[PDB]
Paper text:
The most frequent PTM reaction catalyzed by FIC enzymes is the addition of AMP using ATP as a cofactor, coined AMPylation or adenylylation. Enterococcus faecalis FIC belongs to class III FIC proteins, which are comprised of a single FIC domain and carry an autoinhibitory glutamate in their C-terminal α-helix. We discover that EfFIC has both AMPylation and deAMPylation activities borne by the same active site. Furthermore, the conserved glutamate implements a Ca2+-controlled metal switch that tunes the balance between these activities without conformational change.
Residue numbers in the entry: 5 to 207
Write the structure that this text describes.
């Protein structure tokens, strides 16, 4: 267990560590967008996801953007055992992304893979939007996706991706250059994970 800022700042409370982590990474997410850096990276690849994860969590989480060395025990959900991860990430890279069916299937596959130690959800929600922006000229208006519905559809996706597919298509917007949709979407993505201390636009 190693979070680069826990021993740097006197952090004794998990709530305080979670507070610093959200603040620092939200500032990184803001810069990723405004610098235009978000639009100069490989779309729908592990290389692309790795870039986002490292950009958000460098200096916060150890091995940011790097593939994990052990298995994930987050709930009863079956993430890919680490022995399958090299093969899994190569398959996802080669998966087609022509339409919503193909894009959702790809996203479900990346959610199962969960290649990093932690922050898989937040980095893959940004990654997804970039596939939608490039291939459909759409993004998700995350304000149209309720938290409880989102998690339920995600738990179900290894069996059937129909529920998550609906949530995304119904939330799709053509306002791909709308800064507020991106910023609000960052706060919602963090809310799905229990981080509500800050509003990235106030950073």
């Amino acid at each position: 267990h190693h979070h680069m800022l826990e021993n740097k700042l006197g952090i004794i409370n998990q709530l305080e560590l979670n507070r610093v982590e959200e603040r620092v990474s939200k500032e990184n997410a803001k810069r990723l967008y405004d610098s235009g850096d978000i639009d100069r990276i490989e779309v729908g690849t592990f290389k692309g996801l790795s870039y986002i994860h490292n950009y958000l969590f460098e200096d916060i989480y150890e091995f940011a953007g790097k593939v994990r060395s052990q298995n994930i025990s987050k709930g009863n959900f079956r993430f890919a055992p680490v022995m399958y991860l090299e093969i899994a990430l190569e398959h996802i890279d080669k998966m087609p992304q022509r339409n919503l069916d193909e894009i959702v299937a790809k996203y479900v596959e990346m959610n199962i893979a969960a290649p990093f130690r932690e922050g898989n959800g937040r980095a893959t929600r940004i990654w997804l939007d970039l596939i939608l922006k490039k291939e459909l000229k759409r993004v998700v208006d995350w304000n149209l996706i309720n938290k409880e519905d989102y998690l339920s559809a995600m738990e179900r996706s290894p069996v059937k991706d129909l529920e998550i597919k609906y949530l995304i298509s119904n939330a799709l917007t053509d306002k791909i250059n709308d800064r507020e949709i991106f910023m609000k979407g960052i706060d919602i993505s963090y809310y799905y994970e229990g981080y509500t201390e800050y509003n990235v636009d106030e950073l």
